[PDB]
Amino acid sequence: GLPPGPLENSSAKLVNDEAHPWKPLRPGDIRGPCPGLNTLASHGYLPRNGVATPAQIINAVQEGFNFDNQAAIFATYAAHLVDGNLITDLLSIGRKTRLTGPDPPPPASVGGLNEHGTFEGDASMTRGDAFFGNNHDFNETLFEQLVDYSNRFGGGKYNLTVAGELRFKRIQDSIATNPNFSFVDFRFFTAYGETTFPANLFVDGRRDDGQLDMDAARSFFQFSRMPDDFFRAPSPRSGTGVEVVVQAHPMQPGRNVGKINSYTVDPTSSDFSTPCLMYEKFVNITVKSLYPNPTVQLRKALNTNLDFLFQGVAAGCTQVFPYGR
């Protein structure tokens, strides 16, 4: 199917409703590193087993949280290109699963959102770096640090000021302890945007005040559960206020170089001054390296999904064509 369009009616409304009750996980149900998608699956906005099509994902993030259409399209097709099965049109929101169907040849992994270094990456707020053994499960110690930062910088609530301080703390902790820490290109962008999402999308839409309480935060981050009577945001949004987060502690993209405390700036990386380069490298390097010489049906599926990806790219960038026109 085609990428869904924007919501026809984007008002705040009850999304924890009779048709979308929270249910616990059944054996085989998949949850991953994204509390948004996890919550949508656990309320039946997505299939409850955590395997979905790109169209299902885009519809769910819009309907359940009022995620904006362009952001939804870019994120979903990016994730699907690197982590999903392009023939079956299925993506796991967590671990690799036989439920996404017969795999393409190596080097494509079809690893789901749990695949480290494609979409998922280091210095997540409530998930540990892959180097430490688990990049997807809720981590209580890290959440308690989020609570502490909310107490210190947000009067007990999570807001953009808290995001700015916590984003930097997690980067500095990974620099100090993860000798494989990578913070370039696609991850450099998503790591900043994601810190705004709890303030923009987990705050009840009747308030929309950017101040997320810790009971709601835990419900989403740990239990994939909307608060009782949760209303979605009152208009479409994703990363608004990311400038506040960056401004708090501006960083350059880089990586540790096989040792702790060796953060080395990467001049080949995109940064916020070159957003089109982030798109071009994602396609020319990341996607192309997974599918260097695709067969007929895969080449077609790649080109279709790459066209959809480009719909999510901000105006002013030129589309690139790794497999011709």
Ligand code: HEM
């Ligand atoms: C539109 C499709 C979406 C996809 C494919 C997606 C995928 C992901 C992935 C792979 C991560 C892991 C990045 C990392 O920390 O390593 C992530 C993080 C995150 N996503 Fe999503 N996401 C989407 C939409 C949303 C929405 C709508 C929300 C909120 C309603 C949300 C909230 C978050 C948050 C808070 C994190 C950071 C978790 C943390 O650092 O502890 N995402 N997302």
Ligand SMILES: *[C@@H]1O[C@H](CO)[C@@H](O)[C@H](O)[C@H]1NC(C)=O
């Ligand atoms: C849009 O949705 C809101 C909340 O569900 C509702 O009050 C309003 O009547 C809707 N608008 C239309 C034109 O149906």
Ligand SMILES: *[C@@H]1O[C@H](CO)[C@@H](O)[C@H](O)[C@H]1NC(C)=O
């Ligand atoms: C280490 O970093 C490289 C990229 O620099 C990545 O491919 C690899 O998966 C990382 N592994 C872990 C466990 O962090």
Ligand SMILES: *[C@@H]1O[C@H](CO)[C@@H](O)[C@H](O)[C@H]1NC(C)=O
């Ligand atoms: C959670 O994160 C902490 C702090 O980085 C880490 O020491 C711990 O091993 C992680 N995992 C669990 C299961 O607590």
Ligand SMILES: *[C@@H]1O[C@H](CO)[C@@H](O)[C@H](O)[C@H]1NC(C)=O
């Ligand atoms: C975060 O909350 C604190 C305490 O209420 C406040 O000083 C700060 O201005 C807030 N920041 C935002 C962006 O709301």
Ligand SMILES: *[C@@H]1O[C@H](CO)[C@@H](O)[C@H](O)[C@H]1NC(C)=O
């Ligand atoms: C991506 O590849 C296209 C040719 O298909 C080229 O014009 C463009 O400059 C490349 N961009 C990067 C960042 O490599």
Ligand SMILES: [Cl-]
């Ligand atoms: Cl929209």
Ligand SMILES: [Mg+2]
């Ligand atoms: Mg991560």
